[PDB]
Design a protein around this nucleic acid. Structure first.
Lengths: 200, 99, 69
RNA sequence: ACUCAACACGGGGAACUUUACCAGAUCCGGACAGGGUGAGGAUUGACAGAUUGAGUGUUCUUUCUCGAUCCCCUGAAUGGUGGUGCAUGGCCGCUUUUGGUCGGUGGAGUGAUUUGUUUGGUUGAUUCCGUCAACGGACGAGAUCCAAGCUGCCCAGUAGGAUUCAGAAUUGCCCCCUUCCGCGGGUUUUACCCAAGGGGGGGCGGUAUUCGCUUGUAUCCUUCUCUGCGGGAUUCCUUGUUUUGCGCAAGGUGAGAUUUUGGGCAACAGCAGGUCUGUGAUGCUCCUCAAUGUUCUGGGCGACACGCGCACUACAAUGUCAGUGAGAACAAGAAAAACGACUCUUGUCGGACCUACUUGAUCAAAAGAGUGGGAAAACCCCGGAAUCACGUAGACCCACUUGGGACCGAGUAUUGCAAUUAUUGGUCGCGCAACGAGGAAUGUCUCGUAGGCGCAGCUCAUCAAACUGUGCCGAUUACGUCC
């Protein structure tokens, strides 16, 4: 139908949101939602599992319950999972989290920025960027940027190599922007937008 | 009715795995297949203003979804249908409407 | 129109490394190129192969200039 | 919000709500109990009468009925379309649609610096080529992506054709070509040519009078439809032009001929542009129980109230469809499904949305009613749009006229809890209210374009001269320059 799609859509939104927000500092990145008939299998993909799953499974069962009451599932029609996504550097969202945490704890600007860009480009990233806007020095805002490697910014091929993320840091005397980009060495399967190459 | 399996999805290269391969079971494998196939793809198109306030030069965006639809036929299998269906469950946001 | 330096560069490399063409056919040449190269554009393959032909035609005369010895 | 980047803009077409604003009344949504309340406690709700806009226990009288958190007092918490966009995030617009931006190594200078990124040609393009102390990179350009035109494989019981057989109906056309000979005219004897007639040759009713989207039997097919993944040209020639170069012009080939056509995306550096009326996006402040909170409470106001200026839109001044009447043919994107009540058994059917047919109709429209289908390529739907066409012997006749309607009175039905400041339709009267191609000035356009014309989606009980999208009818001029 036209409708079944939109159901799955709005579901996937709300789901995503609630996890992204309330589950912090585990390096949350993605999920996936699928159904096998009469079950629902929702995986969760976050850098650090031991925080997600809880000490003996309290945390994961918690989330399960929450979901069920909202979207009106029965038990045994919903089950959740965790996974480690290792190579933390190659997720926007992961490094956005980490960077946020440091700025909230009264670390500087340039120090924090650099630390990210290190860990990224060691993981094997082609190039990355980081931005911070908002207060710094005092009055009349400011914006600054830190760049390493190289990246594309046009086409639809920067929408299949570069996935970005944006977050806030709430402080006294101002809000403070933050954003992190990160161009991957890989596509979502394979593809290169240009680069003709001769195989002998 | 007759046995009519429909497959709907939000993208191509999802449908093709289900239909065009893994209904193999009913195909030449054990029994007859009458294969019709695929249907008008619909577009769901949501035009939306781009400025969060009132200023600007009156820019917009257009957004789109695609639906994809398929359809295949079998001439009364008597609960071979159990088998044939159940093997591909695969790919998130593909749904299967059996009649 | 005018051809970018992606096109030109690529095309040169082929003329060099292969004389499993020498043809002045766009057609023959093309079907070599597309199985020797990976570019993942079909547009690029046309322009490359076309330019190739316009090298081989020159090569039948005096020096091409800037494409080895 | 105020030059371009305010002014059919804030998805802003608001009856209530929405809603900020005005008059009046109500409720705690004051968490957290440190400080006070015996079995009655502190407490909640209310019929009747009165107060009151209120058959609103708001409050009082009266009595009954109930958790002891509810209740009383300070501290504190909270909520806010309150303030500040010159505290701030995010997003958007603009600078700027122009071709621009940066570093490494090498070279030159004692170095501020420069070369690369330059005089020239070329291209929409810092696009390429040539010269050359530069070489090799990264962003922008290009490419990758989406739609359109053509095509291959795929496919039909939701796409649509072919043949056969039966049945039904009309029951009629308001033949032709080629050639030879003869003779009378025109002929200058003659050759030549026209009229008339006759003969010969070749077509031919072919294995076919014609017509049924309800008019049915049988059989077969994929040209037209649908769609995923793929094919499909600066090639070729003019040896013109150009430097052999980069390319350029004309022609050819072809479905398509030069950014193939139309979009989306888009660097570096910025603006004290806009937004605190998008958000559990927010710093500091303001307000807090007779509130700036909540108030879906009653009434009014809102982009609405009326000498007047301005912006955008729509309709006209008619006889190039032009205007009232009639008949004929004819378009495509798109839209609809679930809301704890209901009846179903043991864990779930139907209806709230569209539209067809029939009736109403033994007498206007608008309305009314019963039945049926469709979850969408099945129903609506063979989607009978309007522009348009007419050998329709149609009316009309150059007039502010039958051109245009603005205003204005009466009657009626639907929408909604509520249409009064007429809400929307639908027929009578008002037309004797403007207006007869429009000054200075000014807007954006190069081909399926300009212009004309209609439909759907959007908002949403109801109402679109708006916006977004699709289709039909379809031109004139230029293809140049820097004023």
């Amino acid at each position: 139908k036209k409708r079944m799609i939109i159901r799955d859509g709005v579901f996937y939104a709300e789901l995503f949101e609630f996890l992204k927000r309330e589950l912090a500092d585990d390096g949350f990145a993605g999920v996936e939602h699928r159904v096998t008939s009469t079950r629902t299998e929702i995986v969760i993909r976050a850098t650090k599992t031991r925080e997600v799953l809880g000490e003996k499974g309290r945390r994961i069962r918690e989330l399960t319950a929450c979901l069920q009451q909202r979207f009106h599932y029965k038990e045994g029609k919903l089950q959740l999972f965790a996974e480690r996504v290792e190579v933390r550097g190659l997720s926007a969202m992961a490094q956005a989290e980490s960077l946020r945490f440091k700025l909230l704890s009264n670390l500087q600007v340039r120090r924090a920025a650099m630390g990210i860009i290190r860990h990224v480009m060691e993981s094997g990233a082609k190039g990355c960027e980081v931005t911070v806007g908002g207060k710094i020095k005092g009055q009349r805002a400011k914006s600054m940027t830190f760049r390493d490697g190289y990246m594309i910014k046009s086409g639809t091929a920067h929408k299949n190599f570069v996935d970005v993320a944006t977050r806030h840091c709430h402080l006294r005397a101002g809000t403070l922007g933050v954003k992190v980009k990160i161009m991957l060495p890989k596509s979502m399967q394979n593809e290169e937008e240009i680069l003709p190459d001769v195989i002998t | 009715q007759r046995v009519l399996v429909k497959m709907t999805s939000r993208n191509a290269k999802a449908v093709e795995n289900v239909m065009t391969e893994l209904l193999l079971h009913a195909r030449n494998e054990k029994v007859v297949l009458r294969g019709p196939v695929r249907l008008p793809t619909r577009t769901l198109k949501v035009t939306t203003r781009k400025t969060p306030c009132g200023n600007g030069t009156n820019t917009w965006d257009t957004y789109e979804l695609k639906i994809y639809k398929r359809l295949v036929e079998l001439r009364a299998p008597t609960e071979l249908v159990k088998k044939i269906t159940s093997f591909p469950i695969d790919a998130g946001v593909d749904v299967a409407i059996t009649i | 129109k005018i051809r970018t330096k992606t096109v030109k560069r690529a095309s040169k490399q082929l003329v060099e490394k292969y004389f499993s063409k020498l043809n002045k056919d766009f057609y023959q040449n093309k079907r070599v190129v597309m199985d020797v190269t990976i570019a993942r554009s079909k547009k690029l393959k046309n322009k490359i192969a076309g330019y190739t032909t316009h090298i081989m035609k020159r090569l039948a005369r005096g020096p091409v200039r800037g494409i080895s010895l």
